Design a protein around this ligand. Structure first.
Ligand code: NA
Ligand code: NA
Ligand code: NA
Ligand code: ZN
Lengths: 243, 299, 223, 282, 256, 210
RNA sequence: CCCCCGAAGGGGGUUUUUUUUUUUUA
């Protein structure tokens, strides 16, 4: 036990209840490895996301005549935590659930129907982890998919919100994720509509809505950030390509 | 492939029916199916029936050694392996499947990790022994709502189950058949119940992403025909302590947050009824057992 | 290295080595620096503007008296900045209704006291919580303010860094309150400062003797 | 230049426009589906992505690799979203028009083209998914020999009347619009792009031979390496590849007597800026 | 790259086997391709490195540590290799893992004494390799990344063992380098490109430490299409070539 | 394990120059087979190989044969899986140099080497074991009717395994893993003598037997 | 249905450890 939230309204890392961690993103970081790519840092979370495709299906199975196939591979490296994990995570049910979640998230956002008989492989490497990793994965995927030139309806911004007693804390780190229940949100664009809503630990019903309220807002900010990068990276690489 | 071939007329028919506030089996949109819980034989054996959906759960336990990391806790695992018995669309034991992994994870988060079972009450002696309680779900017939039925089956089973009384003298323990000493039930802390909402998009995707006047339809406890045509799915687990045990909206059709909240509350309204039903049926079972004993002691 | 952020914010990396029994594990955390930490003085005009509400939408009360207890020169208009040891030894005097009316409790002192004695930490937190007209205790997050945050030099124990942080806190305080002339007195018993380019540094007994009611409370101190 | 837009951004509230790639719409509202530049061509409104795979178009001249041998057809890698197809009846058989369809040659398809073979072809038509149908019926189309393969992003291939060019040092370049590039020893067929020629045309009886010219001098090979390196240099600088820019790259690279030197970063950048500067000054 | 046509293979081979050898990009037989390296970017780890090659091959190495009893854990250095697109079960991944484990064996791969804390405890070094991209045999790539990571690795300082909270000591050790060579005809090539590796008659894996040609040494098929036998003088050539052109790779890697 | 009877989980395992015989064609359910037993002073080994093939392959059309090599621990779990797969890869290289793969398009040749017995009374043994593996695989390939451009042979000396073809003129395999530092030439000579003897014995076995 | 021809034929849908019991009670 320790002051997760001081009477002064500060946290252990020195943030307030409604402030995001440091969020920085980079696009087209692996031009020789994938069609789209993104390197992303959220707090201490460091993630490489690679989008390969749309491309010819490896098997002449897994081929859909009406739409593209979307696969997601999440690699949580053994050195992502402070203590190295002697076990791989690749076939853990947690990781499979995360993968299927991301797939079913971007099946409804990515216009797969305009890429029939193709496969879109998403390859993710979590280099460093510090809580709220799901939203980070979401953001990385969005960035990398947009970098690939693959059509989609909107951004999807991922964020996490913890619930300490009565007060909700925005964008929780590892220490906050422990000794507290957290809600992960996948928000579509600037809308109030949720692509993802994940609650894995017990939360008082009557206080859930409030937790969403800030969450959405936070996600919006995240969108504004990702956007802000893309435009710049666009503005830079559309002016230099000229003459 | 083993695909379920759905025709355009059927999809359009069911969707249009949803538009005109109609469900095939004659339920309203917020109407959960009548849950039929039937106990039998030994404790921990339960059959759950939701309309045509039929599941069966079997609770069992055996003495084992506590994990090295957790010295005071017992062992608890849940298995939900599908078979072609529920339908040929299911492959035999594809634990790595999307809906399989999802189902397993939802049930695990609802029961095993929520502390619904007292794991420290399973411990016999901290160092060398502990109870290994197992919950094996058997899917007999699939007309949708497998997650909810599984949760109800597992919970009812755990509450119905009784492990044999035992006592301990240092190194050694003494285990009893029913004649020696009566069996004692497990430590149930709360009763998590899952409700699954299905989301349908009546209009086009453009209206869902960038359109006002949200026409997204939500129904409760979808049938197989409804489950096959849905664009989204949410599973919310709650208990009578107004706790959100868990929530899973693993992608699918984007839904407005307020609608999801409303879903959570209506779900609570349902889990009240279901919980009271479970408790009632349990007590009736125990009473009938006692009266049978009373009928056995004197001819 | 530190990064500047959107709204008077910053971030660095607090790195250290935890030594759980039989092992070594390096720990990395992000340490955010801020520009909205209030001095909580009724005399300050600048801070009430840059301050922001909490989770309840609440603007922290400025409770430190505009006119504190005034002593003899070269001490007028003084606030008290405590050290860990002084708190540990004179906690029962800090609770005395007729002395220490306006006291600043640095965050780092709060943390140290917490680490070495939790009940005393609870009593100090009680002092900071029940502050009123009779007694005024505040907590200042010197660690989260860029104005006061000092970073650890190599080959230096934690104590030197802590006391240098308290020192920097006192310095920023003097520089901040001087337009009103509020001085700050760092009360400590640990021979902290060898003359450098300053702050009033008096031991416990010395500060007691500079008080008007010294004879009343001179013997309320451990020997 | 153009309006830069991101996914989900409102492009126009006007419903008059037709809607091309990179857009979707709700009633009169038109939104972007990609990150790129707004494009208005006549009544067609679209959004062009900054990056994307080669999208085959009817009439395009491409270089491809045989990926699969199938039923009456070949599957060729062009570097697009899908494998292109090459119908058996869309290629030239060794000889004149005279030979009729056979079942035998269908059985020995691998003798003409096999897995791994590089070929130069034309996009005859497109399927519904956008994949290309190919043909190699012109005498300039066929299996590629006497050289080396390299590739660049397809967007960097500026286009013209021709994409097969004669370059000094006796080296012919084949610049596929898909970014696939073939560098070969200049042949007599290549020599004949002025304005016994008939015997020359018929002499290529073998257009599916796997054997190279037995006489490829070291000079031509070195020059091949140099052309490859300077093309890669232009690609690194993200300079559009044209014939003139290629020969200018070559000549400008002649400063470095050892071709290896051309693989270093500063050398590539230097060649690029040399070309751009020279272009602006002229 | 990979899957060249027979014509392409014949051209490339003829150029690479001629005297002197003509490499597709005009490199000298002993010349490497431009790479760049970054270190110290993973704070959670004791060491870290990232290496990017000109052809796109990218690798990431993490160095972590944990206290162990020598007596219970005789191996104080463990290499775990993860190649993207390849399962951990894969033959090539376990081959590379075994090889690297042998190059870095505490026995004589590196100086074990530099790890010792107490007569009962020491730091075990966990070398985690993540190959993001590779178009040729990544053994040299990985080896170089590991070299850089180890030469910039910091460990907690000793004062049951207790450690300094803020101060850390730089791990001092001479990490080995593994070189890969392509045997094409009578010519030896360093840093073989993918197309070069597609036509190579064979290959030579040659380890190297403290300025000496050390073990492991392997012959390795860079492909399955043109694997041919070779004369011993070629092996001698490869060894001589490494020990001649290795100290400059060492001084290039160790200058920070 | 759901596919095996491993018994109780609570249980824990119990802790506590050379002559050659070569034979072929004794295994009936595969194409080729070879038994190789070696006896040196205070050291005895014996292993078996089985060549299944040419068989069909799953996947796209392949222009040539595809060889797989599987090393199986016999009796004692004597070696690490990684090292076994490494040696497997080495042997794959060697017999990719030796086997006439052009003859077997869209076809796979799977070779299994059972390391039944390896007890040396002397008180990293992989090196000394590799040449016998190569002998057995060459014998089994020749027995299976699988075409070989030559008889792959090998020798071991000072942790240095060298595999030769063409009367020892050229090298198809080279394995050096620690095992001390000595100059290359005498290891080459010793391994070449071993190779020549093994070659003579193998051809002899292929002339008395096949 | 697109592809030629001319005015019908041929080809194609892509098999973390921040460091004296009980009861009522002024
Ligand atoms: Na969003
Ligand atoms: Na905010
Ligand atoms: Na084959
Ligand atoms: Zn102030």
């Amino acid at each position: 036990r320790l002051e997760i939230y001081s009477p002064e309204g500060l946290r252990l890392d020195g943030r307030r209840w409604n402030e995001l961690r440091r969020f920085e993103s980079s696009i087209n970081t692996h031009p020789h490895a994938a069609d789209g790519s993104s390197y992303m840092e959220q707090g201490n979370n460091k993630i490489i996301t690679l989008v390969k495709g749309p491309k010819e299906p490896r098997l002449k199975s897994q081929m859909d005549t009406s739409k593209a196939l979307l696969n997601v591979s999440v690699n949580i490296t053994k050195f992502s935590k402070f203590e190295r994990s002697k076990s791989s995570h690749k076939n853990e049910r947690r990781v499979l659930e995360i993968q299927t979640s991301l797939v079913r998230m971007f099946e409804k956002n990515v216009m797969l129907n305009i890429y029939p008989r193709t496969v879109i492989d998403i390859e993710i490497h979590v280099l460093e982890q510090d809580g709220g990793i799901m939203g980070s994965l979401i953001n990385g995927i969005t960035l990398a998919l947009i970098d690939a030139g693959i059509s989609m309806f909107d951004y999807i911004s991922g964020i996490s919100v913890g619930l300490y007693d009565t007060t909700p804390l925005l964008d929780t780190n590892s220490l906050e994720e422990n000794a507290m229940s957290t809600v992960t949100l996948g928000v579509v664009g600037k809308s109030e509509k949720l692509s993802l809503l994940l609650v894995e630990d017990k939360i008082p019903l009557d206080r859930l809505e409030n937790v969403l309220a800030i969450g959405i807002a936070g996600a919006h900010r995240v969108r504004d950030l990702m956007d802000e990068e893309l435009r710049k990276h666009a503005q830079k690489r559309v002016s230099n390509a000229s003459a | 492939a083993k695909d379920i071939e759905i025709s355009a007329s059927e999809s359009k028919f069911i969707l249009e029916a949803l538009r005109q506030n109609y469900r095939l089996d004659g339920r309203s949109f917020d109407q959960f199916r009548d849950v039929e819980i039937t106990f039998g034989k030994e404790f921990g054996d339960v059959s759950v029936k939701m309309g045509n959906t039929k599941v069966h759960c079997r609770i069992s336990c055996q003495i084992a050694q506590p994990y090295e990391d957790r010295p005071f806790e017992g062992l608890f695992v849940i298995s939900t392996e599908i078979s072609p018995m529920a339908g040929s669309q299911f492959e035999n034991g594809n634990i790595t499947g999307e809906d399989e992994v999802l189902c397993s994870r939802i049930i695990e988060k609802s029961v095993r990790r929520s502390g619904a079972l007292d794991v420290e009450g399973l411990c016999i002696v901290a160092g060398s022994k502990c109870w290994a309680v197992r919950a094996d779900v058997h899917f007999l017939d699939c007309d949708g709502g497998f997650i909810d039925a599984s949760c109800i089956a597992v919970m009812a089973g755990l509450m119905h189950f009784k492990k044999p009384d035992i006592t301990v003298h240092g190194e050694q323990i003494i285990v009893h058949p029913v004649n020696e000493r009566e069996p004692v039930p497990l430590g149930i802390l709360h009763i998590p119940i899952c409700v699954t909402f299905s989301f349908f998009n009546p209009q086009d995707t453009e209206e869902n992403i960038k359109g006002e006047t949200n026409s997204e339809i939500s129904i409760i406890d979808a049938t197989l025909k409804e489950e096959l045509l849905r664009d989204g799915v949410l599973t919310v687990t709650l208990n009578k302590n107004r706790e959100v045990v868990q929530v899973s909206k693993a992608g699918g059709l984007p839904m407005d947050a307020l609608t999801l909240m409303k879903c959570c509350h209506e779900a609570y309204s349902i889990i009240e009824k279901i919980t009271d039903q479970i408790l009632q049926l349990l007590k009736e079972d125990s009473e009938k057992r006692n009266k049978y004993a009373a009928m056995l002691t004197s001819e | 290295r530190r990064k500047r952020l959107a709204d008077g914010l910053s971030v660095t990396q607090k790195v250290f080595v935890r030594s759980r029994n039989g092992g070594a594990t390096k720990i990395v955390r992000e340490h955010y620096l801020r520009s909205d930490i209030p001095c909580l003085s009724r005399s300050c005009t600048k801070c009430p503007q840059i301050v922001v509400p909490d989770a309840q939408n609440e603007l922290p009360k400025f409770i430190l008296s505009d006119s504190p207890l005034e002593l003899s020169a070269p001490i007028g208009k003084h606030y008290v900045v405590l050290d860990t040891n002084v708190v540990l030894q004179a906690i029962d005097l800090l609770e005395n209704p007729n002395c220490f009316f306006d006291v600043i409790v640095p965050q780092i002192v709060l943390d140290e006291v917490r680490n070495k004695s939790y009940p005393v930490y609870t009593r100090l937190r009680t002092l900071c919580r029940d502050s009123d007209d009779h007694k005024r205790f505040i907590v200042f997050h010197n660690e989260f303010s860029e104005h006061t945050f000092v970073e650890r030099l190599p080959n230096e124990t934690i104590n030197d860094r802590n006391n240098r942080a308290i020192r920097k806190t006192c310095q920023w305080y003097s520089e901040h309150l001087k337009p009103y002339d509020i001085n700050v007195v760092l009360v400590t018993n640990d021979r902290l400062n060898r003359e450098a380019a300053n702050i009033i540094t008096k031991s416990l007994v010395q500060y007691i003797e500079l008080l008007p009611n010294a004879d009343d409370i001179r013997d309320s101190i451990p020997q | 230049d153009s309006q830069i837009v991101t996914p989900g951004e409102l492009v126009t509230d006007d419903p008059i426009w037709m809607r091309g790639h990179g857009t979707y719409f709700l009633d009169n509202m038109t939104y972007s589906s990609v990150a790129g530049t707004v494009s208005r061509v006549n009544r067609l409104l679209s959004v062009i992505p900054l990056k994307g795979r080669y999208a085959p178009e009817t009439g395009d001249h491409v270089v491809g690799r045989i990926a699969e041998v199938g039923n009456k057809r070949w599957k060729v890698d062009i570097g697009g979203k899908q494998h292109a197809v090459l119908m058996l009846g869309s290629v030239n058989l060794p000889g004149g028009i005279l030979r009729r369809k056979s079942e035998s040659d269908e059985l020995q398809m691998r003798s003409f083209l096999k897995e791994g073979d590089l070929l130069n072809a034309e996009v005859q038509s497109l399927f519904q998914d956008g994949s290309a149908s190919l043909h190699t019926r012109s005498l300039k189309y066929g299996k590629l020999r006497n050289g080396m393969f390299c590739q660049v992003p397809s967007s960097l291939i500026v286009r013209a009347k021709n994409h097969t060019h004669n370059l000094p040092g006796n080296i012919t370049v084949v610049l596929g619009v898909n970014g696939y590039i073939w560098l070969r020893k200049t042949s007599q067929m290549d020599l004949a792009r002025d304005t016994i020629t008939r015997l020359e045309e018929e002499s290529s009886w073998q257009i599916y031979s796997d054997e190279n010219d037995p006489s490829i001098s070291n000079n031509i090979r070195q020059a091949i390496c140099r052309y490859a390196n300077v093309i890669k240099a232009l690609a690194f600088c993200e300079i559009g590849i044209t014939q003139q820019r290629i020969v200018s790259a070559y000549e400008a690279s002649m400063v470095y007597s050892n071709v290896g030197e051309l693989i270093e970063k500063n050398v590539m950048e230097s060649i690029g800026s040399d070309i751009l500067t020279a272009e602006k000054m002229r | 790259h990979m899957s060249l046509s027979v014509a392409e293979k014949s051209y490339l081979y003829d150029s690479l086997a001629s005297t002197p050898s003509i490499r597709p990009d005009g490199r000298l037989p002993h010349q490497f391709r431009p790479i760049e390296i970054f270190t110290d970017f993973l704070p959670s780890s004791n060491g870290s490195s990232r290496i990017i090659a000109s052809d796109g091959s990218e690798c990431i190495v993490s160095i972590k540590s944990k206290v162990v009893d020598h007596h219970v854990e005789n191996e104080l250095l463990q290499v775990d290799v993860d190649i993207a697109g390849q399962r951990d079960d894969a033959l090539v991944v376990e081959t590379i893992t075994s090889l690297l484990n042998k190059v870095l064996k505490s026995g004589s791969g590196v100086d074990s004494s530099k790890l010792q804390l107490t007569k009962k405890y020491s730091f075990k070094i966990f070398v985690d390799v993540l190959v993001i991209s590779s178009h040729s045999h990544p053994i040299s790539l990985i080896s170089f990344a590991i070299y850089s990571a180890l030469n910039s690795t910091y460990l907690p300082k000793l004062i049951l063992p207790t450690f300094h909270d803020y101060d850390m000591v730089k791990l001092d050790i001479n990490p080995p380098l593994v070189f890969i060579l392509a045997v094409v005809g009578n010519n030896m090539l360093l840093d073989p490109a993918a197309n070069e590796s597609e036509v190579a008659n064979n290959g030579l894996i040659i380890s190297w430490s403290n300025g000496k040609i050390t073990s492991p040494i392997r012959s390795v098929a860079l492909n399955d299409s043109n694997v041919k036998s070779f004369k011993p003088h070629l092996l001698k050539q490869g060894l001589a070539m490494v020990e001649k052109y290795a100290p400059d790779v060492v001084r290039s890697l160790e200058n920070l | 394990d759901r596919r095996r009877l491993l018994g109780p989980a609570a249980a824990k395992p119990m802790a506590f120059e050379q002559e050659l015989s070569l034979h072929t064609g004794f295994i009936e359910n595969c194409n080729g087979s070879a038994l190789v037993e070696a006896r040196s002073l205070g050291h005895q080994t014996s292993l078996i190989t089985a060549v299944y093939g040419p068989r069909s392959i799953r996947g796209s059309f392949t222009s040539q044969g595809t060889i797989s090599i599987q090393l199986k621990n016999g009796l004692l779990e004597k070696y690490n899986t990684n090292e076994l797969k490494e040696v497997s890869s080495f042997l794959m290289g060697i017999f990719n140099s030796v086997v006439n793969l052009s003859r077997y398009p869209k076809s796979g040749i799977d070779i299994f080497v059972y390391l039944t017995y390896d007890k040396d009374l002397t008180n990293s043994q992989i090196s000394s074991l590799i040449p016998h593996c190569i002998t057995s695989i060459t014998l089994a390939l020749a027995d299976a009717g699988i075409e070989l451009v030559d008889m792959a042979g090998a020798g071991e000396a000072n942790g240095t395994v060298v595999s030769f073809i063409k009367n020892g003129e050229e090298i198809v395999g080279f394995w050096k893993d620690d095992g001390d530092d000595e100059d290359l030439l005498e290891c080459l000579d010793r391994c070449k003598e071993q190779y020549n003897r093994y070659r003579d014995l193998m051809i002899s076995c292929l002339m008395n037997q096949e």
